[PDB]
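S.,

As promised, the 0SO run. Input:
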Amino acid sequence: DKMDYDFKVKLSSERERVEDLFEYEGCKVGRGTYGHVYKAKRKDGKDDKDYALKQIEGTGISMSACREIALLRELKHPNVISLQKVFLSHADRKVWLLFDYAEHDLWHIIKFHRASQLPRGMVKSLLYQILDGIHYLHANWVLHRDLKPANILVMGEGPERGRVKIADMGTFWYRAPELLLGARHYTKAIDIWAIGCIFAELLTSEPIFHCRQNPYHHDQLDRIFNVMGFPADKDWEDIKKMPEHSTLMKDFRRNTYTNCSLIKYMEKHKVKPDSKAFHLLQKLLTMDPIKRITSEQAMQDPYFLEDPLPTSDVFAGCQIPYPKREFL
Amino acid sequence: KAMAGNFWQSSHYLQWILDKQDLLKERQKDLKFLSEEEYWKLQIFFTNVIQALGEHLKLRQQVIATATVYFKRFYARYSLKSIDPVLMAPTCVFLASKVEEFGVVSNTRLIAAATSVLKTRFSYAFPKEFPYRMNHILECEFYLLELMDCCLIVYHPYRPLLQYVQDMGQEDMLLPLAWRIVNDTYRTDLCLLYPPFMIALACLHVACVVQQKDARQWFAELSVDMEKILEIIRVILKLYEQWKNFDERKEMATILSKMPKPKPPP
Ligand SMILES: Cc1ccc(-n2nc(C(C)(C)C)cc2NC(=O)NCCCNC(=O)OC(C)(C)C)cc1
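Predicted complex:
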């Protein structure tokens, strides 16, 4: 090798290995593109805390490995997911990452309600933390790029009872129209559009832009317009600058979505159009990306001064009716 | 652009701004084989090796500084015998290029880059061909990533430098020269011992003194410990005297010979 032997045996001896430190086998909680995730307690005594233990897909320090590590190694906010430790395994060269174990997420909660409405103090708290976390990420010029209920984790019983944790794991329901009109560049405003869809989803328990499945996606657009209405030139002036604009003009007619709008949609789902909640949702679900409010501005909306105030614990100190994550 | 203002809550700042006296203590290890002078000449030599590897591969100067910081940090706490610095140099470029989002440098292209630069630019130090294959780089990378405690994002002086000279309103006169002095600071321990903006101020002071431009009032108006800036000026001014007397090409084969060698297994 021509690499010092003492140095190699010292570091090898002292190196912590995931399988010595953590009990995890049989306790797989998620598959996916970016790895397999296991729910993992510790073998050695000094912990009651579960941890999400994630084996990255593949060998070596890949571009995806490198990025995920790079960022989370720096980020500290109570509403971003936290990286407790990295394990590099020299034998097989697989990279392991530890993350504090969030029992639930918004995909499972909303679904659970959709099997039988979603309590309002909770709804307003959920959004407020989602905003506080995303504002932090945006402040540090870090865009999420793929927000949706499956990526809003919520901590279970423990010292972080009911606190939203933003995460990235690996549909076009939460995508802003400009992305669908082939915008070749992610932005802060694209995230805020996605937070808009969630909020609406929370209030009603249905996805606002629910739809069956290049960057141009026709049927998904038809749904936005069926809900939102077709944008007037005045509403979004630079729609013409979007690369798939003339194709939009080819396949759609403004008149088709005449007399249908977000108020008429939310009215149907028993959300009152003169509520602070609606008036905010509207500012998130703005079609022209540069006319959406920022995350900071939304946090300052009087909706969060309206009774009841959002609580740190999303669950209001109540019993949690949602079930624990199944193994596979 | 990511994490662009997080310095004071950074892993850089909270774990990789080292105390000088701790740094020179764990250095006494290699000082039994190399003298103090020889050791800093080595540091220049590899600062220049990483530079050429950057240049050869077409890479922005920000990627080279990151690479150069990873090389310093490794040998900042470990002996020159532990891993070969000829292996560790391109490995740092390889990792930096990933961390700084320009892409993976290919197996073939990375190894040709090493092979060619030592063959071309550093023929005097290395009469045998670059020996390592890609499996080596991949192995050393893990050892490098573990040693850094996965601290990949690195702040450099070029951003604060820029912001400062734009605030002065003499960007054209000072930026070309100040930027060069900052590159030259990587020949020293400075990136391990001072926040990037300080090194930025330090360099920017020299630039103005070399260019005879008075900026006393502008400097007076800053809320920084000017004692600490004088420390960095001192070191910049000296490295240039180090440059003058150091005859890299005549000396370095002897100095690379003195390096403590790795021990292969029993
Ligand atoms: C390649 C890559 C993948 C993911 C990320 N990333 N980005 C983020 C931001 C946007 C929140 C900052 C977060 C990540 N990664 C993660 O959060 N990984 C955690 C995996 C935790 N898994 C987990 O808790 O499992 C269940 C399914 C039970 C919830 C970065 C890069």
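The domain at 1-101 of chain A is CATH 3.30.200.20 (Phosphorylase Kinase; domain 1). The pocket of 0SO is lined by residues A 29-30, 34, 37, 52, 54, 64, 67-68, 71, 80-81, 99, 102, 105, 142, 144, 153, 166-168, 325 (CB under 6 Å).

- D.
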